[PDB]
Design a protein around this ligand. Structure first.
Ligand SMILES: CCCCCCCCCCCCCCCC(=O)O
Ligand SMILES: CCCCCCCCCCCCCCCC(=O)O
Ligand SMILES: CCCCCCCCCCCCCCCC(=O)O
Lengths: 54, 252, 237, 267, 267, 60, 54, 54, 267, 60
């Protein structure tokens, strides 16, 4: 039995009943961010206060 | 002796020799906005001596066949000094108030007044289909008065100003659930209420929304004998408290 | 396949149930809470606030502010009655519509004491003394000041302090009382008489007025929530 | 939540005046009946548990009912979500100025047979669909429409003869609390709409039959029930005296404060 | 709750007199049969578990049944709640003077088809509503009424073909116990109503169809069942001899104490 | 979704059952108990009290 | 969870699910007897072997 | 699993099954009173036995 | 997943230039509004929980509906499994290039009565069978066929009037992810089929009535719902502007980028 | 035979539910995962990328 944290703005219990991992519920609580691979895909890093081209 | 007060705000002072206690809102004193409740993210303006001072409105005459008066509170101070100039250049704002109603008469007069302060006092119309237009709902530091009769349906956009329904469809005797005081000419001379900021949002626009209403209703009418002074005025004095503004733009 | 067995009370909709239900919008971020002044936690905090009582109905004062004023004169005799009404805080039309009498019309049972505050809104040179009595049931209504002084009374002397409180105690054979009118659970009568006269100087008006207030003590409680009979509907608005 | 108990008392002759006060201060007197008369000691076991805001408001109340017919061109129902068309829930929620709660939604669906003309009318079990469209989305215009694909709008399906459908709704708002009263306009020029209609934007609810009109028309009716959970409340208010007349505003006809009696001394 | 066992005994010749007593004292003799004759030792394993007040009264009993018709103007049913219209539960509860219990309520609802005149009559599943109004509230006057909004009155909904509906009721009273008998009046002048009708104020129960009359009338019948739980009882009472005649009072016609035989020595 | 299976005896009303049911009036404060004299706990205490026997029926 | 003794001539388990004490099951196992308040309600006690009146 | 006290005039068990805190049951047992903010909203405190105005 | 909070700032006069940048590098500027003006400290409590890929895609969406008639020669339905016949799920899945998820499948089955000619038409409860054939197996050619023996093909049975049937499907693929777009052919000679039809091989789904045509025809309709679970996504994509025209390819008719206004300074 | 009682909300299809369901193909071996470049975890990473704005609509 897994005890998790129950998103608010208190806990709950979860037991798995079936033998296959495709039978479980949705994840719904995997909050992970990596915006840098789309917004800054450059080779040399760029400091904000410095000019872009020297 | 509890009978004397002295209130000092800016360059103005009120002195009273015959008074009841001071009613403080819902137990809360006015204060500035905290960092946990803020949503607008630019720096606010706090003038704090040029706006937080006592402004006096006009005076009304208490007659014998007198029914009542009301004021919409962030609207009578819309042309008063540097308070009404910050409202025109900014988009947001929040304010607490201090109200001092004052009326004096001799030991040979009688009468009683109820001074309440109603948050979100939405009013009704005399024609059942429309809503009242702006010129009847409020005035620029001038009282709108109730009447002892009923406004007919032949008018289109007018407020239903029967006193015993208080303009809102409720009982007038149950208005004592709001913060209030009485003025009894036997014992009292003034009334003082301190109100904090009450809204469902941390800031609001002060030109599309009136969030307070001050009503003065005579329950026991004014009476005197022959020879006494027939002219009795009532004067209201309001002071903003802990005011701040956001969103500079053009003058509107 | 765990073996189970379903009992009576299945697939029913009881409107006062206490169950869990699946959410229709999963993983929602609500707006954070703010400190708004004036939070109500119990309905009894509303009922413990004074409210003006219309003792002066009299067939033409109900569409006026004159229903709240109690007339007081200077007499040529002694021992006259000012007002009187039975103590029924949810069925009698005097205390029916007040701030205490509207919370009671949502419930069925009530229990506790009741405060009654009187204010003298006359001139500052007028005097007077009054008698504020309460009579438990069993006999009728007192018709004299001699019969009304045998109950629970207070003598009010009007001076600089302009208010007085008559605290109606809880005298009952049971623990609770019915809100609707019921002769088994009656509560009695509240009257008011002249002790002495209203003596006034020259060039002062003789006729004065008295206001009345009502609230609840700190032992008041209610029970058995129901609907109110004070609203109608015919079609949807 | 036990109430206070009674304290015994003695005959007094002193300077202290509990009965004399001043109601001009806006301050309710805090006298107990053991100050004005001789009392006995009584232990009270009564509780104030049934008058809480969590107990006063957490009951199911009907808010609307609508009908829709099977054998009809464009036979389906819509409803813009508000709490101001019924008279009993509107008076309970307007004892306060600001409210904040979660919701529980329950639907009660019935059916009725219409006077068809064919012989041997026998229909299978009916299935209904109830769709919720948040403000801004696409709305259905007929029964066989593409808008019922419910790709991201939440909907529910139900077959007749079972337990009623139920779901939960969190505190969906833009502000910090719901507002029962709004004293202002929606335009900055102070024209047009005045009142609570400037804050109402909750969506629309659609209802239809999923089956086809086989051999006889069928007229259904849904009923909607609200139940507030996890309630907070602020700034109480006097109860409404007059009768409600419209939905958008607070217009009334004036009425007396009570009913009358024949004398001031009438018991 | 085992019973007492038998003690062995011997032949006696003594001054002690267990068999001689005096019934004039209002005192029942405490003799066992091992004092009047020679007995053997017998271990009793019998128990008094089935005669407890918790076991004698905690069974379901029918109290009322009422009918209401679909195709009818003002077709609905009402009932003022009491326990004095049936003869079997009234005799069981009136063995005591004061009672105090919780309650369990169960409803059994049936339906029947009335002789309509149309062809191809086929109706969907029926839904019923049962409403409880505490004393003082608003009552329904017809079927399409505003009083069925059930904002604070508890009600229940049920679809035909499932388990029967059930709910619990606590000890709702104003006194400290229920009273089966009241020897007094309701007025202080000793006029008017005399008896148990002065204490009966429990409310009214309303019943209706939620569906519409489609093409054929339908007549339904509800049945109500009471079941006391957590019972306490005080001051027992002789059982009733005569037959009950009315509901409000205890009026009877006199009858003999037993049935007769032909002689005093007839076995 | 826990897998379950329903047995015979489902959706039946046996008049002497022993189950729990949801309350129709939640959070109710009952009147406190009082000491009334003469509490009956078992029906056998009633049957152990003397009673006069009509041995002389004889048709009139 | 309460474990009780299950009347015979072996145990069972009982859990309460609701918040009100009026929602529980029946007691059914409170065996208590006091027959003396009905059968011997006298002031002075009476011994069985002694005579009633002296 | 939460074990609470089950209002009388005895305990019960409660487990949460869903991931959102809006899916729980009602509170129903939060008894808190503060009547002083409505009945005595004054600045200087007032003793009952003393007069109101000196 | 809380958002970043605001930092207080002061008036500056310096060499650092946050507002000046170069967008020619393909690099989005990382300026906050506390660099261009004076701000206050604000603690943000907002979360990005509702915009996750697990929350954006895990909802049920209709993909197909088909009909089949009882009283018909060869009356049964088939469907080749794809996600490109509806317009709302196709636009949501084509925001990415590669996807990988599990599946949840739900069916909604209704029925309707057809205009028969006999009298006293009364039919029992209907039972349906839904069969899944992986690519390469034997397919049914009629209703009474040997291919419905379902010895190793998974199937499901359902009786009308209950909860809808539901089952789970794992990530069934030959590659490492599903592909929404394929820029190539299926032949090495670069002829014939070009596009996403070269990768679609998922099977066929069959539907039939298990009962017999008793005395009246019955027309049923099934509806299929998809729900992706355990989602991973790669390489985002611009959303579709034009309207979809076919299923196998991405052919369109050209349209403007937005709607027009009357001037460049029109507000 | 454990005694149970079914609540409202039974046998309904809410399209945003979160339940477990039995698998139709038991004991399936999925293809192992590969490192593909450009994984999206949140939709806000897409919205934080510059895009050219058509300010010059003007009817043609
Ligand atoms: C099938 C899902 C249905 C979803 C229904 C969601 C309905 C939203 C509820 C809005 C609450 C309205 C509260 C009153 C608003 C106000 O007083 O201003
Ligand atoms: C749908 C909810 C129905 C609620 C029904 C509540 C019925 C109240 C029960 C009252 C018990 C009556 C006991 C006998 C009274 C007496 O003997 O004086
Ligand atoms: C009764 C059992 C039914 C079994 C149904 C299995 C259906 C297989 C699902 C295939 C998922 C298709 C995903 C999209 C394919 C793609 O985009 O290329």
């Amino acid at each position: 039995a897994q005890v998790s944290t129950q998103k608010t703005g208190i806990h709950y219990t979860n037991i798995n009943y079936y033998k296959d991992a495709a039978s479980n519920s949705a994840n719904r609580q995997d909050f992970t961010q990596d915006p840098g691979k789309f917004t800054e895909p450059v080779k040399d890093i760029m400091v904000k206060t410095m000019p872009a081209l020297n | 002796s509890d009978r004397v007060r002295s209130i000092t705000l800016g360059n103005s002072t009120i002195t009273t020799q015959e008074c009841a206690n001071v009613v403080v809102g819902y137990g809360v004193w006015p204060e500035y906005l905290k960092d946990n409740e803020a949503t607008a993210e630019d720096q606010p303006t706090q003038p704090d001596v040029a706006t937080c001072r006592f402004y006096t409105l006009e005076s009304v005459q208490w007659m014998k066949n007198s029914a009542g008066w009301w004021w919409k509170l962030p609207d009578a101070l819309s042309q008063m000094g540097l308070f009404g100039q910050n409202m025109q250049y900014h988009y947001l704002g929040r304010t607490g108030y201090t109200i001092h109603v004052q009326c004096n008469a001799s030991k040979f007069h009688q009468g009683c007044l109820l001074v309440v302060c109603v948050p979100e006092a939405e009013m009704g119309c005399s024609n059942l289909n429309n809503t009242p237009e702006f010129s009847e709902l409020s005035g620029g530091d001038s009282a709108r008065m109730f009447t002892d009769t009923q406004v007919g349906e032949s008018n289109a956009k007018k407020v239903q100003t029967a006193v015993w329904n208080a303009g809102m469809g409720v009982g007038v005797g149950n208005l004592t659930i709001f913060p209030h005081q009485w003025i009894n000419l036997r014992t009292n001379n003034s009334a003082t209420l301190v109100m904090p900021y009450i809204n469902s949002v941390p800031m609001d626009n002060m030109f599309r929304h009136n969030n307070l209403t001050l009503m003065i209703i005579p329950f026991v009418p004014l009476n005197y004998s022959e020879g006494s002074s027939p002219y009795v005025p009532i004067t209201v004095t309001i002071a903003p408290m802990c005011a701040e503004y956001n969103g500079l733009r053009l003058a509107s | 396949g765990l073996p189970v067995m379903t009992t009576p009370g299945s697939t029913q909709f009881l409107t006062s149930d206490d169950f869990q239900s699946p959410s229709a919008m999963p993983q929602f971020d609500v707006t954070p809470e703010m400190q708004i002044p004036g939070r109500v936690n119990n309905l009894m905090e509303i009922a413990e606030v004074d409210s003006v009582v219309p003792v002066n109905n009299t067939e033409d004062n109900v569409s006026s502010l004159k229903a709240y004023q109690i007339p007081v004169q200077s007499n040529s005799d002694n021992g006259k009655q000012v007002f009187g009404f039975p103590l029924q805080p949810g069925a009698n039309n005097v205390l029916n519509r007040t701030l205490l009498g509207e919370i009671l019309n949502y419930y069925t049972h009530w229990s506790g004491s009741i405060k009654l505050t009187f204010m003298f809104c006359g001139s500052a040179m007028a005097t007077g003394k009054f008698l504020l009595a309460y009579s438990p049931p069993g006999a009728g209504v007192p018709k004299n000041r001699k019969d009304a002084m045998l109950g629970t009374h207070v003598i009010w002397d009007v001076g600089l302090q302009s208010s007085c409180v008559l605290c109606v105690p809880w005298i009952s054979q049971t623990h609770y009382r019915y809100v609707v009118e019921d002769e088994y659970t009656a509560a009695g009568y509240v009257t008011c008489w002249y002790q002495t006269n209203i003596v006034v100087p020259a060039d002062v008006q003789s006729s004065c007025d008295i206001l009345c207030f009502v609230s609840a003590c700190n032992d008041f409680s209610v029970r058995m929530l129901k609907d109110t009979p004070f609203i109608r509907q015919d079609t949807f608005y | 939540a036990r109430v206070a108990d009674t304290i015994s008392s003695r005959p007094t002759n002193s300077e202290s005046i509990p009965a004399l006060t001043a109601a001009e201060t806006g301050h309710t007197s805090q006298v107990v009946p053991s100050d004005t008369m001789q009392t006995r000691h009584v232990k009270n076991y009564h509780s104030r548990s049934e008058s809480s805001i969590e107990n006063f408001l957490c009951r199911s109340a009907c808010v609307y009912y609508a009908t829709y017919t099977n054998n009809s061109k464009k036979g389906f129902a819509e409803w813009v979500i508000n709490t101001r068309q019924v008279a009993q829930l509107r008076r309970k929620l307007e004892l306060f100025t600001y409210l904040r709660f979660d919701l529980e939604l329950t639907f009660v669906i019935t059916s009725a047979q219409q006077p068809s003309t064919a012989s041997s009318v026998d229909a299978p079990v009916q299935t209904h669909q109830i769709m919720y469209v948040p403000p801004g989305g696409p709305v259905p215009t007929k029964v066989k429409d593409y808008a019922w694909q419910t790709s991201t709008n939440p909907s529910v399906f139900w077959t007749e003869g079972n337990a009623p459908p139920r779901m939960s709704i969190p505190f969906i708002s833009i502000g910090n609390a719901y507002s029962c009263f709004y004293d202002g306009w929606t335009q900055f020029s102070r024209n047009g709409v005045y009142g609570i209609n400037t804050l109402n934007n909750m969506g629309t609810l659609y209802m239809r039959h999923v089956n086809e009109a086989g051999q006889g028309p069928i007229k259904s009716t849904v009923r909607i029930y609200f139940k507030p959970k996890h309630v907070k409340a602020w700034v109480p208010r006097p109860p409404r005296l007059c009768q409600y007349e419209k939905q958008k505003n607070v217009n009334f006809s004036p009425i007396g404060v009570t009913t009358s009696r024949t004398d001031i001394i009438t018991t």
